[PDB]
């Protein structure tokens, strides 16, 4: 949820988890709510499908074994996490989201294949 | 290559007498690729069971089958006059399909 | 030694039938002018084609048990019906017509309602002979679709321009394309292919000749449900499309009259200029070449008998005349000059000009669809279409093939014959040596 | 429905070639059907001769090279026809011959398996004496 | 789309199962023809995951289970299962024991969860 | 949700948790119900995943049981009390327990990321 | 308006026809 | 549907007489209803179709 | 709504048996409601005597054997009636007896649990002097 | 029942009142609510005299 949207990434990252969407519990308006609910369900399921294919099935913060290419960003850790917000970061790496998604999927495939190989 | 044999070479029963016709295979048909036929005298074979225990349309529900490894059985509840005749056991799990010898059911 | 292992995403599929949604082109309602086929609501917009060639996969296709064609039939009928709900209802002119009797038009007079319920206006309108049935000089008549249904005018903005309509599939399903040349539509297919969306099937409705359709790859293909049965229509597919040019060379006048509050009924007033019969031109050389190829292909399936095309027997104009839609004006052409020959071959090589009769009380679908009234088009109309197939009907030394005959579905069976709706089952259990939970 | 009829009954001298015909009424095409040829001895069990499946002809090892199976599907006049032609007849061929067709359209019917299938429609049969 | 390697034998296809991996997807007549499809696809996917989760996998493309391979399900050895058999052929062969295998996997995961809880004491 | 053994006490019922699985008037009644069921299932899993229990029927957590929720011993809770009675007893502290579970799982994720440096 | 003469009544009314102009007397 | 063991009386409020007593029978009385008159259906046309 | 009225003030000689009757106007049935009997001594606090809950009657250990709780639900003439009979009256029984009915329909109301409930509706009260 | 707001601190967002789609959706919804509210009402076609 968009709270702490002006906080630099490092400061917000701790606040990404202070509130984690917890504790939720044929007229003109009939179609609106139904279409909205179906679209929201589909979008949430798509987000989990991406999040699951990378091995992060139920993790808010998920570490990965993919090394950070420098072509994606030459900026250092402190220059990313101290003077940059999440919108600015996702705009900076807006051209490498598809590639990073593919690399995450490939890395999880490699890890799962290696795990199955070890069990044999 | 797989030789299928039928338990009761001939059998004797009357109306209302349920008969279990058994069949055994040279190998293990784990896919249940076994079919059952009936041949009335002077007529062509009729298919009753395919895939172990599945019934064709137009075949009485009294005919039923069971599949267990190498053992395949055919049960005829409430045997009737038209049911009398030679019954065959076929496997199509491996080439070529092979037929059992026979099980004649007579009054 | 071996342990169960569960795989998600295995290439396992089954035959199934589901609802296929639409995906029209980016033009929406043809740059936003309402199409009867509601093609801006085909929300999916088709940007890119994703296909996969299923290697070493043979799938059995039976185009006569396709549910895609029936879904197309129902969707087209529903789209046609829903476009006529907003439009004017023409119950006021199921009225006795004082038609001047001794061209196919008739000058008729009738008392018609005005915007005021109290008053009535006498109206003069030119009604075609095909839309008029005698009531049983100045004989009295009535509209043909008076004792069956209540007609509805066509909305002026609604356009009957068939633009491609794609049948795409939901997630978890796939469409199998045959991609196999000279496919009879019934049998094994070697290069089956998986597509998300079908090609553009234009909802072109026609009776004896299939126009603007998809044309075959390597040869003329003959598709019938049952060749021995003579009640099963023979669908012929073309390698190459004969070109037909259909015109109505008479400038016509639409003079809208007010038959109620905000309800304007558009009638044909008169012809400014010469009175000219409508016609469709088909080159004799190309038509006879293609018809010779069709005759040879029919000889292949019919025991090398001499193939005799003879003109349709007769009946309703819809049944026994080439019906189509030029620019919102519906034509009913005589194809007797086209289908008249015996092979095993008329030697003419010039243009074949076939008479056509325009109608206005339209019943495209034989009772299942609504009955409409098509308002006249002002100027002269010219439409340039390519014919890509024929619908024949053999009747029981030689075999005779009357043209026409069939259901409405047969127009789209040359389009949806190679597509098969398939349900994907992604769970799979196989034995492997993992041993760990 | 579906009805299979064979070519009567023939009695021929040994060494001749006999052609049995199989005319399948109710079969839309042999692309979605497979004709399986089986022979029944006068007192013994049924044997399997050969088949045409997806327009491919094959016979069991016992009958390889000694039998010919051909088929043509719907025409204007005739239904799909299948022909069984035995060559070099001997006294051991004094058996009834049957023609069978099964629907190989859907892969999950269970009536067929990798081209080795059950027998669903049975013809009248041509007893051959020699 | 999951249907790419479909004539390939299971051994060769299983490599290409993860190559695709579904990597990226990033009241008129057509009004209901899309909503019904959406709901059906969503609930079918949720059923597939609900089956997948009950076996302990819950987000693994190739999931390893501790259930021994009963011989009644298939007497075919691993090499002739994975070298001359495609996925449709295999699932047709084991089409009669899918429900039993599902039940055995659910029971096995229940047993493993009970053992894990017992060890935690 | 498995009714049956619902009059059974918690100790006996917890064992009996088992294999979970294996326009017209009726036109909208089916669709609305299906969408509501999907949204409820995805909310149950949404809660269950936030606590690290995704894909687990019986999930253990590192949250100590406060006595303010109940000072009833393990035997008293699990030997003479059914699930409905228990959830009525602790019906006031479900939101607080949900918050504590989410906070505990957040702390565990932070510690796991820290240990990986 | 009906011109009438579970005991039935034989009512007479003149009512519409397929044509809007013409009316048919109905019993 | 008919009751199992006996006749059951179900009313929303017995004391109130504006509430309809509903009787359920565990035995079903059989009613035979007939209209013995040969009737003629003649269909006139009141409009288009 | 719901209104409860009771028998009335009575004066009894010690050793006698007194019956207090409670008629519930607004209770559809005592299957869904529960009648709880409460006594209030002059100046002192309220006590609990006994109840009928789900047509099962019980009394507090102090009053066991010295009291009967009886009830009948709706009839055509009268609303549901609950009766409180105190056998073997002694001077300690001088208290304003009360009648209560609590809705036990839904288990998640909170007014009740395991047959021990808070009292929602209160009768007028019948002072008894002895 | 409750507002459930939150203040985005240090967040600057550009607003264009004249390209808002919420107002267009409001217009369409209001027009549809008037349109459906008059369907089950008298037709008053006799009044055009
Ligand atoms: C819809 O359908 C439903 C069913 O499907 C249906 O439900 C049925 O409803 C009816 C009501 O309409 C129910 O019938 C009533 O049930 C009442 C409850 O009875 C129970 O409790 C008594 C008392 O139990 C205590 O005492 C005994 C004996 O000492 C002990 O053994 C008990 O353990 C218990 O003791 C504890 O509690 C004491 C305090 O009360 C403590 O002091 C003690 O220490 C303990 O802690 C039992 O006697 C009952 O047992 C009966 O059944 C068993 C076998 O099952 C028999 O062996 C036994 O003899 C009993 O018959 C039961 O356990 C009853 O009170 C009530 O009885 C009245 O009506 C009947 C007529 O039916 C009379 O004969 C009877 O005399 C009662 O009338 C008195 O009360 C009314 C009420 O005001 C007065 O108006 C009347 O004048 C009369 O008062 C006089 O007598 C009193 C003593 O009797 C006296 O105190 C007064 O002062 C005065 O002198 C009746 O039977 C039925 O059970 C329901 N059935 C089911 C299955 O639920 C429902 O109604 C339907 N809905 C509608 C709208 O129709
Ligand atoms: C839609 O479109 C699709 C495609 O686009 C279309 O599909 C097409 O359908 C056609 C049918 O209409 C089909 O054409 C037929 O194909 C038949 C199969 O041909 C193959 O097999 C034969 C036999 O192969 C045997 O034998 C040879 C030689 O010994 C050997 O080399 C083989 O390996 C194989 O041996 C194996 O099997 C033996 C058992 O059979 C065994 O003993 C061996 O040991 C070994 O195991 C080959 O010869 C071919 O080359 C193919 O490989 C084919 O049989 C059939 O031929 C018939 O028709 C021809 C005319 O087209 C005739 O010229 C020919 O003689 C056949 O006619 C005989 O049979 C008919 C059947 O009733 C009979 O009526 C005739 O009178 C005649 O009988 C007489 O001759 C035979 C000998 O020929 C004698 O035995 C008799 O006694 C009589 O004397 C067709 O050619 C086509 O392939 C197919 N195409 C595709 C791509 O799928 C579909 O049909 C269309 N849909 C519609 C509705 O139209
Ligand atoms: C099934 O159907 C029956 C019949 O319809 C129904 O019974 C009726 O229940 C209602 C309860 O809402 C009863 O109304 C109350 O009755 C009591 C006592 O009634 C008896 O006495 C009166 C007077 O002699 C008679 O008329 C009657 O017939 C009975 O014999 C009354 O005391 C109540 O008085 C209230 O009404 C006043 C206006 O009239 C209000 O101003 C005020 O609310 C009164 O209550 C106040 O009194 C308290 C002091 O006692 C005071 O402290 C409070 O502030 C309180 O507000 C009221 O009239 C009605 O009489 C019953 N009728 C019959 C024939 O029995 C069942 O309820 C129904 N069952 C269900 C489940 O719905
Ligand atoms: C292996 O699995 C297949 C899966 O289909 C089983 O085939 C099915 O078998 C059942 C049981 O006979 C069939 O149901 C019956 O169908 C007949 C049709 O005439 C009907 O009359 C009966 O009342 C009953 O419903 C079912 O149709 C059949 N399905 C298919 C596709 O064949 C097969 O039986 C299984 N093998 C064993 C040994 O159980
Ligand atoms: C078969 O396809 C051809 C072309 O693909 C169709 O001809 C085209 O028809 C459209 C409308 O039906 C014509 O567009 C219209 O042109 C008029 C006059 O210029 C204009 O006023 C309209 O606003 C609209 O733009 C188009 O010009 C015409 N093209 C040609 C080359 O003739 C033909 O109608 C199709 N046949 C059938 C039976 O649908
Ligand atoms: C295509 O249409 C033809 C003609 O309608 C169908 O052929 C007919 O098939 C039926 C079987 O359903 C035949 O009836 C049977 O014929 C045998 C031999 O005479 C007879 O012994 C049976 O008692 C029964 O009468 C019928 O004769 C046959 N007609 C002709 C003239 O061929 C064919 O079934 C249809 N094919 C498809 C795809 O369904
Ligand atoms: C950046 O590095 C990744 C590996 O982490 C690699 O897959 C990717 O191709 C690299 N980018 C380019 C443009 O090569
Ligand atoms: C971000 O970069 C600027 C560049 O001049 C620097 O001044 C600033 O200190 C950096 N942010 C932090 C938090 O240090
Ligand atoms: C038809 O119209 C002509 C003139 O328009 C008139 O003379 C004649 O009487 C009319 N016929 C009828 C039947 O109204
Ligand atoms: C199937 O199509 C592909 C390309 O569309 C082609 O390469 C292939 O040759 C075709 N199949 C056969 C058997 O030729
Ligand atoms: C059809 O295909 C080409 C034209 O595309 C033509 O040359 C060929 O001869 C025709 N095939 C037939 C049916 O003979
Ligand atoms: C054709 O008819 C229309 C109808 O009014 C007219 O406007 C137009 O000028 C005519 N065209 C010619 C060339 O006369
Ligand atoms: C039809 O028109 C096209 C182009 O307008 C032309 O090339 C063709 O020759 C015409 N055909 C006939 C039969 O006039
Ligand atoms: C015939 O006209 C159609 C109109 O859409 C066109 O698509 C097709 O390409 C034309 N035929 C040929 C051979 O170009
Ligand atoms: C079946 O399994 C047994 C082992 O118990 C083996 O000996 C036999 O060869 C197997 N048969 C087949 C057909 O796999
Ligand atoms: C599959 O089995 C056949 C016969 O059992 C064998 O010849 C073939 O080699 C096997 N597959 C492979 C890939 O070896
Ligand atoms: C009970 O414990 C929980 C966490 O274990 C805590 O959040 C809550 O404040 C505690 N309540 C009291 C009254 O101490
Ligand atoms: C339970 O704990 C509370 C305070 O937490 C205490 O007052 C009470 O006595 C305890 N009960 C028992 C049985 O220990
Ligand atoms: C549970 O409590 C009830 C009443 O307090 C008691 O009767 C029962 O014995 C208790 N359970 C056990 C196992 O003792
Ligand atoms: C029916 O028509 C006649 C004239 O044809 C007219 O006099 C009569 O009034 C009409 N019926 C009624 C009920 O008015
Ligand atoms: C209930 O059972 C049977 C009806 O099936 C009948 O004999 C009996 O008397 C019934 N009871 C009552 C109370 O009607
Ligand atoms: C009753 O009358 C109807 C009306 O024509 C007729 O069809 C039917 O046969 C009659 N039945 C008897 C039994 O007369």
Numbering used by the authors:
A (entry chain J): 522 to 546, 568 to 662
B (entry chain D): 1 to 30, 30A, 31 to 106
C (entry chain A): 33 to 134, 152 to 185, 187G, 188 to 309, 312 to 321, 321A, 322 to 358, 360 to 396, ...
D (entry chain C), I (entry chain G): 1 to 35, 35A, 36 to 52, 54 to 77, 77A, 77B, 77C, 77D, ...
E (entry chain B): 521 to 546, 568 to 662
F (entry chain F): 521 to 542, 568 to 662
G (entry chain E): 128 to 132, 152 to 173
H (entry chain E): 264 to 309, 312 to 314
Sentences copied from the publication:
Structural studies involving temsavir and related analogs indicate that these compounds bind to Env within a conserved binding pocket that partially overlaps the CD4 binding site, i.e. utilizing the pocket where Phe43 of CD4 is normally inserted (referred to as the Phe43 cavity). By binding within the interface between the nascent bridging sheet and the gp120 inner domain, temsavir stabilizes the closed Env conformation and prevents CD4-induced conformational rearrangements of the inner domain layers that lead to the formation of the bridging sheet which is necessary for coreceptor binding.
To characterize the structural changes induced by the LMHS mutations, we determined the Cryo-EM structures of wild type CRF01_AE T/F100 SOSIP.664 and its LMHS mutant unbound and bound to temsavir. The structural alignments indicate no significant changes to the overall conformation of the T/F100 LMHS SOSIP.664 mutant as compared to its wild type counterpart. Furthermore, both structures could be superimposed with an RMSD value of 1.18 Å for the main chain atoms of the trimer. Interestingly, both the wild type T/F100 SOSIP.664 and its LMHS mutant appear to be slightly ‘more open’ than the Clade A, BG505 SOSIP.664 used here as a reference (the rotation/opening angles are 3.28° and 3.39° for wild type and LMHS mutant T/F100 SOSIP.664 respectively). Structural superimpositions with the wild type T/F100 SOSIP unequivocally confirm that the large side chain of His375 represents the major obstacle in the temsavir binding by causing a direct steric clash to the main anchoring region of the compound ‘head’ phenyl moiety. In the unmutated CRF01_AE Env, Trp427 and the residues surrounding the pocket are rigidified by interactions mediated by Layers 2 and 3, the LM residues blocking entry to the pocket, and the movement of the β20-β21 loop. β20-β21 loop movement is required for pocket formation and to anchor temsavir within the pocket.
